[PDB]
Amino acid sequence: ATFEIVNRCSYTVWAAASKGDAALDAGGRQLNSGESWTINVEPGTNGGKIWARTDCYFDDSGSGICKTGDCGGLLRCKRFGRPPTTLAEFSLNQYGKDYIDISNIKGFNVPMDFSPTTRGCRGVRCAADIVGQCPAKLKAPGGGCNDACTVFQTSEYCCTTGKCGPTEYSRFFKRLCPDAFSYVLDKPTTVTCPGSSNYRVTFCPTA
Template identity: 65%
Template sequence: MFSSVLFSFTHAATFEIVNQCSYTVWAGAVPGGGQQLNQGQSWTINVNPGTTQARIWPRTNCNFDGNGQGKCETGDCGGLLQCQGYGSPPNTLAEYALNQFNNMDFLDISLVDGFNVPMDFSPTTGGCRGIRCSADINGQCPTELKAPGGCNNPCTVFKTDEYCCNSWTCGPTTYSKFFKDRCPDAYSYPKDDPTSTFTCPSGTNYKVVFCP
């Protein structure tokens, strides 16, 4: 009993989420919930070792009542301030899985659900490299992918196998290259693993910055 408790304290990862945008961002996190972050504010969550399929994302133009119910223009998670599920596109994603193969954490920035806010996702310990997507994707977004407050991934718009990669045959497209040219570290389509997945030693702590 004691050793397992000690292990969880030793290897839980801390994620500091910082809003450097000139506007308010409502952070969403699974696990974690959600938090309104005005310019310069931060929010820290602690995540258990072994957590997989986790993500942190920015939500914009939100309105919540005193019960934490409302809506966001981008990244909305079922109308809740405290997210229990993932956000709706378009939203820039910081994705991670902790303490996986060879005791490594796996992390990425994904544009597979589109883009709404520039992001940096970096270790604060562990001696491994961070990743960033800080281009003006909203300003340069192709007309057919434009969405209120963001830039959609083509899968969201066209829903075809070519863009959604429901089979194993898909590859880069003109649209995925638009994202990749601007954010080389980020996932631009679902099968973009070789250039878009990064690792850090288990036990690393992280910082996610909106508008780095």
């Protein structure tokens, strides 16, 4: 499958793509404002994620740091990033279908649209000003709006026991972005697409 990753933000982001134990394609790249990066993701990929990283500094060897979404200090991510990270999530060719969603379960850093470029399903978007409206206790100094599990590490926020409800904090994310997951047991906002669809992820789709 092809993913086109587009930075429509006015600031540079460092895109990342991983399935947790491996890079997808090159795993990461700098995207200046307006730039597009096309990657190829193997059919059958389960549990892939794409996200943006902000305020990064990398040396010639591809080693450094980012203020949001850092993946162990690498430009080319092999593992998932440090919250807060708005997440585009996908599993491809699962018994004939692709499944896509956006998640705020690991917080929010950059607004996002995640849409098919082929026919058969709709896209999803979270483009509200979550960072500007972020509750004081969830604000991340480096930028972004943390999820409550990251901040407070309780069974209820992290849904550790497999039983948990919505919370004041999850409802904040859900109010601003109804079409994204706001906590682990949220009513699913997953979209089902035809197997082997292609996609575009756009950072700052309205900004």
